[model samples]
Target: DYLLSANGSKAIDFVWSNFLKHPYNPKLKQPDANVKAAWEKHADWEHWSNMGQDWSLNTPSGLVPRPNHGIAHTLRVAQLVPVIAEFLKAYSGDPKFQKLTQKEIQKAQYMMLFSVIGRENDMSWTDANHYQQAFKEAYNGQYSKHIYATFKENAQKGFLNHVVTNKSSLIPSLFSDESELQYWAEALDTGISSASGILMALAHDLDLMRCYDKGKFNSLKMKDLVARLGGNEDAAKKLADYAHDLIVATGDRCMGYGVTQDYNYSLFGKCSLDPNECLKQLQSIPKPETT
Candidate 1:
């Protein structure tokens, strides 16, 4: 509404200049050359290729990828659909955008969502060192210590050895029946699944309290969301499909231009098993995009 009311491009320019440009923003100042460069481009995708150079929301790697940075956390995925829907609802009558392609529509949907979420919320990640300290203190040093000790111990053994040897093991059981090579290919192609799956898991666990509330369609869970839209399983499936597509589309676009992670391996010492067994595990179940 504001964008349309006041020329859209100018409104965007106003936001970038007054809100995201400098001391007005709450996020910490960029720490170095690479990070500062990415931060500067957060206002637009003009310099996208020069942004995210290390682990980011989309291309996260390493043991503790910082998913909580910027507007690209699991919460963003949850809040994505509702934000897009709200924008469309508010501007449904605008005739100026009648010629948008499907991809362009997806792009607009995310830009709207990101703009709102980034400006309204505290979308920042804890430093790698702080996160590491908490993890160790929670599971290795206090009365509640050794919480993940068992898994850590097992992972230290050959259990993780076989995994790194065959990256195909990262494919979820849903695709387990496929041939090994096929599963490997599918696993590589399913990064979006794991990415969005992280958001869904966080939603279920209430980790994304604000995003979950906003993301809920009419404040409805899947079943209720289906019913309110006329109560057919198909309605539920379609919602899920749109949600998944939007996540992957937007995530891929912002992958290298969002946030970068700090390099830290002290918390998780090098694996004692075969070096060949050093592979990324499937962190989440990859559900096929419904569409």
Candidate 2:
């Protein structure tokens, strides 16, 4: 349990501090070992992420959690850039865009991403006992609604961009095709749902999950919920359940890297992202049929 806590704490710290505290040293030395380790570990994070298709996929905690003893996460910021950019270019060009209030949504999408990153950084450090609470708190109180607005805004924003950049001469105008609108809507819905899950995971780890309960978190999501109604609500509800299950499962036990070294094979099969010769045996649950 202690080992589990220590490693988890260190992982959170690693995400935040990011070796920015120390001066870069050309020559390797004992004094620079910690910084060097952090830097090396940072690159390893990305490597693990891009290595294979869902190779190390874990439950998405905003940024997906990497496999045990792994340094990288699953979510890639680079991929979302073009997605948001496409929405921005199109929404800005439409004549009805101004009347429908599209620009505000674009700003919110960009802002929400930046905001989540900032908050996640805070969670990472505080998880390690470094403890910085000001930024995240202020963001929640002041910008939470703005962040919520970003989701719906981004949907409409994406609609315009998809039409312009889509290269399909089939639909020159974004507003003409309702299916394209639905497509963008689903994309935005999924993006925000993933973000919500990550926030939920963080809150769960921090013992602050109650603060983000349905009344609070769900309130921020209502706009999207109402707009898409049945379809949108269904997806959001599924992701929320996913978040709840993950939080409960993670907190109930001390899941160490050693315990789950072969989790890939247990969950997946003969193939995995990084298969090892010897699988460690710290602890495990019996197969359902065994009992």
Candidate 3:
């Protein structure tokens, strides 16, 4: 019932404007105090994901990987640094993006973690008002429907569940006894990352459809869509290349992190890497060859 046009409370406006206009300060401040509180609540719940056997156990098949939970999300968020940086650079001089700084951009990117990771399901009523509404504004409601449609279709087919559980019903040929973890890791991780890539492509197109230009934003490859949006071709190619590289590197990285016993648990009962350290690891991962 929350119509984007009708819902413009100060809280919602503050969250959206912070993403678009101001630097992302993790520390709570006036006007954005609500966002800070929601994030604090989110932080508490995210800690739960690190508990139990799934994060730490290894069977003959390999370690039971974390289910894209809070810790995994830190890694994924780190993975996105380059992608977001490229997008910001590509759009930098434009009036719409002129106010963006790297820290603010990183904060904006972290805010999006709510949408992609399971944090949306953990929303308090206040977060639903402040964060969720802000997300609707960020993407301008263009790709969310399609993204959900894709998720639904994949879920109905058990594609996501199977991948998460290490059951390869769809790609039996891809997994061999010798390469169980590594092979299936690439497959499952790439499948998930590919979904993310599709959303990114859709997001890019939606940005064009809503802001820079008005047109049908359907079915075009990302490169073509970027051209339509008047994004620099060089930058577009770099984005494409980085995405392709990420598919493989992320898979390897996920597998490596998933099985590292030390990475999974800590005495402090918090994520082993903070946001900046997570970002550092993702950047240091060697790029994989793209086919």
Candidate of highest TM-score = 3
- lDDT score, candidate 3, position 84: 43
Model 1, range 1-291, lDDT digits (tens) per residue? 222222223323332333322221322222344433433444532222221222222232333222222223322332443333332223333333334433333323223322322221122222322223344444444332221232223222322233344335333321233364243322211112232222222232222222233344334445443443345556444445444433333332221111212322331112101111111110121333322
Question: Candidates ranked by lDDT, best first?
Answer: 3, 1, 2
lDDT of 3 by residue, 81-154 (tens): 43544464454333444344443343334223322222212222232344443344454542223222332233
Q: Cα miss at 73, model 2 (Å)?
A: 11
TM-score of each: 0.26, 0.22, 0.32
Please, what's the RMSD in Å of model 1? 21.9
For model 1, the local distance difference test gives 0.30
By TM-score, the better pick of 1 and 2 is 1
As for TM-score, the candidate ahead, 2 or 3, is 3
- List clash counts for every candidate, in order: 2, 3, 0
The best-first sequence of candidates by TM-score reads 3, 1, 2
Give the alpha carbon lDDT tens digit for every residue of 180-224 in model 2. 444434443322233222222222222212123344444444333
Q: What is the lDDT of residue 58 in candidate 2?
A: 39
